[PDB]
């Protein structure tokens, strides 16, 4: 079947290699998952692997755990759409989820979370506890606090569409986890989106 060996791949010189064995199972490959972004249901097929272990082909994922690195938050956030891919636009067009692809995610969590945690409302909406007031103002007065101008401009629209990058390998663990872009990577990919919106 799909073999990931190099007995067919010619020598580094350019000389042909004469194969004198047939394909061993320990060097097989399996067809790509090509995880599609699908609004709704998740599909995950378990795959029996070299030691009887499991891999998890994600077919048709919908969302996943997305982390706010500076904030240590990690909410499950319902991927909206694949916006950018590093090299080929065919995966962006057909909405294929692969690691290191850039996606718009819901982000109404990390907003309700930001409120619950800091007591800070990021958009004008469109009992009260003494200990909660105390703790929210403490977490406000901590040192590294402050929401950056590229993240709050996103969390301040009434329909949040925050830019995350997918970190898991969905065809291997069946997950579309990722991290929200922060700072210079956010600026990079926002600039790419600008370029292809204008050109």
């Amino acid at each position: 079947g799909i073999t990931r060996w190099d007995l067919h791949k010619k020598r580094a010189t350019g000389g042909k290699r004469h194969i004198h064995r047939k394909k061993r199972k320990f060097e097989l490959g399996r067809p790509p998952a090509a995880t599609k972004l699908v609004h709704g249901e998740r599909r995950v097929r378990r795959v029996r692997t070299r030691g009887g272990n499991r891999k998890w082909r994600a077919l048709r994922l919908s969302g996943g755990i997305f982390s706010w690195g500076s904030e240590n938050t990690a909410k499950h956030c319902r991927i909206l759409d694949v916006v950018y891919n590093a090299t080929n636009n065919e995966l962006v067009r057909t909405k294929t989820l692969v690691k290191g692809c850039i996606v718009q995610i819901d982000g109404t969590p990390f907003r309700n979370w930001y409120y619950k945690w800091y007591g800070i409302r990021l958009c004008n909406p469109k009992r009260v506890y003494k200990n909660h007031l105390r703790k929210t103002h403490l977490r406000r007065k901590q040192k590294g606090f402050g929401l950056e101008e590229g993240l709050q401009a996103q969390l301040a629209v009434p329909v949040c569409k925050i830019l995350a990058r997918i970190s898991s390998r969905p065809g291997q663990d069946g997950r579309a986890n990722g991290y929200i872009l922060e700072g210079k990577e956010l600026e990079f990919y926002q600039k790419k989106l600008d370029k292809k919106k204008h050109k």
């Binding site: 190099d6 791949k9 580094a12 690195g69 500076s70 590093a86 090299t87 290191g100 040192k143 590294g144 606090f145 950056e148 922060e182 700072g183 210079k184 990577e185 990079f188 990919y189």
Partner: protein, 148 residues
């Protein structure tokens, strides 16, 4: 030169989180401008280039600023040519002793070796390169020292 990369992706270093609120001074280097950089000191009697420690380039397959571990043979060759990107051809002219005729032959072996952007080198300079995991079809060695 080869610090340049593609502009299709945002090349970051693996073990450095660029958006840390209160980062530590563990990777603040003693000659940098506050720029944090993960690096290691491969430890077979080699020195981590100041270019690697204080540089800005991003390189996986670099033995000093990436997860690539130097283990196995460590050979010495000459840079034949540098016509690939971050890869370089290295030659080892050695002498193989024929037993019957009690003499030697001139033989050679080429190697597609991986030069990190931490090394200044001209064509013809000597190189010590150590073995790493396979980085490509023919590349399985990284350049650990350039000798003028």
């Amino acid at each position: 030169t080869e610090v340049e990369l593609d502009d299709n992706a945002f090349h970051k270093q693996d073990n450095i989180f660029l958006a840390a609120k209160n980062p530590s001074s563990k990777w603040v280097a003693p000659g940098s401008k506050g720029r944090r950089r993960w690096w290691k000191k491969i430890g077979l009697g080699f020195k981590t280039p100041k270019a690697a420690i204080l540089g800005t380039y991003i390189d996986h397959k670099c033995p000093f600023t990436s997860k690539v571990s130097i283990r196995g043979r460590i050979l010495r060759g000459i840079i034949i040519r540098h016509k690939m990107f971050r890869t370089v051809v290295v030659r080892r002219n050695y002498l193989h002793y024929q037993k019957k005729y009690k003499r030697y032959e001139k033989r050679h072996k080429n190697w597609s070796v991986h030069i990190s952007p931490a090394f200044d080198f001209s064509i013809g300079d000597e190189v010590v390169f150590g073995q790493c995991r396979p980085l490509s079809k023919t590349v399985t060695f990284n350049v650990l020292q350039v000798v003028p």
